[PDB]
Design an enzyme around this catalytic site. Structure first.
Site, PDB file in Angstrom:
ATOM      1  N   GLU A 135       7.980  -0.258   0.317  1.00 10.29           N
ATOM      2  CA  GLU A 135       6.639  -0.975   0.760  1.00 10.29           C
ATOM      3  C   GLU A 135       7.089  -2.618   1.434  1.00 10.29           C
ATOM      4  OE1 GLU A 135       3.029   0.649   0.994  1.00 10.29           O
ATOM      5  OE2 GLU A 135       4.276   2.235   2.545  1.00 10.29           O
TER       6      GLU A 135
ATOM      7  N   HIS B  95       4.914   5.307  -2.963  1.00 13.55           N
ATOM      8  CA  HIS B  95       5.704   5.418  -1.726  1.00 13.55           C
ATOM      9  C   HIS B  95       7.492   5.821  -1.741  1.00 13.55           C
ATOM     10  CE1 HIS B  95       2.232   3.937   0.856  1.00 13.55           C
ATOM     11  NE2 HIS B  95       2.322   3.036  -0.173  1.00 13.55           N
TER      12      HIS B  95
ATOM     13  N   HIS C 278       0.639  12.634   3.665  1.00 10.22           N
ATOM     14  CA  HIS C 278       1.393  11.448   3.395  1.00 10.22           C
ATOM     15  C   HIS C 278       1.875  10.674   2.093  1.00 10.22           C
ATOM     16  CE1 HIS C 278      -1.164  11.800   7.504  1.00 10.22           C
ATOM     17  NE2 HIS C 278      -1.886  11.135   6.416  1.00 10.22           N
TER      18      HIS C 278
ATOM     19  N   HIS D   1       1.506   2.215  -6.255  1.00 12.52           N
ATOM     20  CA  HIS D   1       0.271   1.341  -5.903  1.00 12.52           C
ATOM     21  C   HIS D   1      -0.618   1.797  -6.221  1.00 12.52           C
ATOM     22  CE1 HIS D   1       2.389   0.174  -1.499  1.00 12.52           C
ATOM     23  NE2 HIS D   1       2.341  -0.258  -2.484  1.00 12.52           N
TER      24      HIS D   1
ATOM     25  N   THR E 299      -1.336  -0.089   3.686  1.00 15.42           N
ATOM     26  CA  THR E 299      -0.366   0.056   4.296  1.00 15.42           C
ATOM     27  C   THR E 299      -0.287   1.603   5.134  1.00 15.42           C
ATOM     28  OG1 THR E 299       0.775   0.961   2.770  1.00 15.42           O
ATOM     29  CG2 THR E 299       0.699  -1.407   2.932  1.00 15.42           C
TER      30      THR E 299
ATOM     31  N   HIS F 182      -0.804   6.247  -5.611  1.00 13.25           N
ATOM     32  CA  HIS F 182       0.042   6.990  -5.036  1.00 13.25           C
ATOM     33  C   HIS F 182       1.157   6.478  -4.823  1.00 13.25           C
ATOM     34  CE1 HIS F 182      -2.156   3.816  -2.419  1.00 13.25           C
ATOM     35  NE2 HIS F 182      -0.732   4.035  -1.628  1.00 13.25           N
TER      36      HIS F 182
HETATM   37  C1  LIG Z   1      -6.674   8.732   6.523  1.00 14.50           C
HETATM   38  C2  LIG Z   1      -7.662   7.830   6.640  1.00 14.50           C
HETATM   39  N1  LIG Z   1      -7.519   7.252   5.491  1.00 14.50           N
HETATM   40  C3  LIG Z   1      -6.976   6.298   4.948  1.00 14.50           C
HETATM   41  C4  LIG Z   1      -7.498   4.847   3.953  1.00 14.50           C
HETATM   42  C5  LIG Z   1      -6.503   4.238   2.963  1.00 14.50           C
HETATM   43  C6  LIG Z   1      -4.907   3.861   3.512  1.00 14.50           C
HETATM   44  C7  LIG Z   1      -4.997   2.850   2.320  1.00 14.50           C
HETATM   45  C8  LIG Z   1      -3.194   2.225   1.375  1.00 14.50           C
HETATM   46  O1  LIG Z   1      -2.731   1.681   2.332  1.00 14.50           O
HETATM   47  O2  LIG Z   1      -3.100   2.435   0.190  1.00 14.50           O
HETATM   48  N2  LIG Z   1      -5.892   2.976   1.202  1.00 14.50           N
HETATM   49  C9  LIG Z   1      -6.206   2.989  -0.545  1.00 14.50           C
HETATM   50  N3  LIG Z   1      -6.389   4.300   1.789  1.00 14.50           N
HETATM   51  C10 LIG Z   1      -8.522   4.693   4.222  1.00 14.50           C
HETATM   52  C11 LIG Z   1      -9.566   4.356   3.766  1.00 14.50           C
HETATM   53  C12 LIG Z   1     -10.998   3.664   4.680  1.00 14.50           C
HETATM   54  C13 LIG Z   1     -11.097   4.929   5.031  1.00 14.50           C
HETATM   55  C14 LIG Z   1     -10.133   6.233   5.834  1.00 14.50           C
HETATM   56  C15 LIG Z   1      -8.869   5.902   4.817  1.00 14.50           C
HETATM   57 ZN   LIG Z   2       0.502   2.498  -1.070  1.00 17.78          ZN
END
Ligand SMILES: CCn1cc(-c2cc(C(=O)O)n(C)n2)c2ccccc21
Ligand SMILES: [Zn+2]
Length: 257
Positions: free
Chosen positions: A103, A93, A61, A116, A195, A91
């Site tokens: 975003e 986007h 992703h 981020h 997000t 990371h």
């Molecule tokens: C792919 C699954 N997953 C993806 C995330 C995740 C998603 C994000 C993000 O939207 O930045 N973070 C920082 N961490 C996550 C956090 C706790 C447990 C599972 C998680």
């Molecule tokens: Zn992000």
């Protein structure tokens, strides 16, 4: 499984993750005229001098640059936060075109990309516990516009060839994330969410007003990454952003006038 395509993208996420339609989802549009200056907000304290980067991972992703978060080595404090938040990863986007990719938006303006820097509240002991709490994470968001190169980004750009496809990782020690910051730490802040799925409502968002500039060549290299695994048909890793979500019952606060 979820992604950014027509058949598995942001408009589908709510079926597996209902909280997608929740009360504090991210990202949001930042309406600069409606944000409220809050004189009680403190300056951010970004303490990255002892940061220990470890590895860079293509997770299918985006790519994550991961840090040692087993001690208080790189921490965020101050601003709207109480307590100490440890850097775990950063990371980005980004878009398929320079006119999209961020975003958050600013008065509906989209930037070419958004960085981020993800931190977790040490009072919860580990990241997995932190994401279950309304004040578990603090994410520092930084906009990228295309113009001059960002020298501190180039080491990231140059390793991407080695993590082209989903599941590949590479050593990424001795990277200094201070080289990704703009001059000013003026910011907007609001309560929100992850997000990507699981979209948990655990984030204090801190979005810097000043973008960093990166070169067209730097962002072009982001766009050569792949969503797919090795030996699968090539799908370029572009447009891995969630669009702005309803603000609902939230106020965005500004640290600056
Ligand atoms: C792919 C699954 N997953 C993806 C995330 C995740 C998603 C994000 C993000 O939207 O930045 N973070 C920082 N961490 C996550 C956090 C706790 C447990 C599972 C998680
Ligand atoms: Zn992000």
């Amino acid at each position: 499984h979820w992604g950014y395509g027509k058949h598995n993208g942001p408009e589908h996420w709510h079926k597996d993750f209902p909280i997608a339609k929740g009360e504090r989802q991210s990202p949001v549009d930042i309406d600069t005229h409606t944000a409220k200056y809050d004189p009680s907000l403190k300056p951010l304290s970004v303490s990255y001098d002892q940061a220990t980067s470890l590895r860079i991972l293509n997770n299918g992703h985006a790519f994550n640059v991961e840090f040692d978060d087993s001690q208080d080595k790189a921490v965020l404090k101050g601003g709207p936060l109480d307590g100490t938040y440890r850097l775990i990863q950063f990371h980005f986007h980004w878009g398929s075109l320079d006119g999209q990719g961020s975003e958050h938006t600013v008065d509906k303006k989209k930037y070419a990309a958004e960085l981020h820097l993800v931190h977790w509240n040490t009072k919860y002991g580990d990241f997995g516990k932190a994401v279950q709490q309304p004040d578990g994470l603090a994410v520092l968001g930084i906009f990228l516009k295309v113009g001059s190169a960002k020298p501190g980004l180039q080491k990231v750009v140059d390793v991407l060839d080695s993590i082209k496809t989903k599941g590949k990782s590479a050593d990424f020690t001795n990277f200094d994330p201070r080289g990704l910051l703009p001059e000013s730490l003026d910011y907007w802040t609001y309560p929100g969410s992850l997000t990507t799925p699981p979209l948990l409502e655990c984030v204090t968002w801190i979005v810097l007003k000043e973008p960093i500039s990166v070169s067209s060549e730097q962002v072009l290299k982001f766009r050569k990454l792949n969503f797919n695994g090795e030996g699968e048909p090539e799908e370029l890793m572009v447009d891995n952003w969630r669009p702005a979500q309803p603000l609902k019952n939230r106020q965005i606060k500004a640290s600056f006038k």
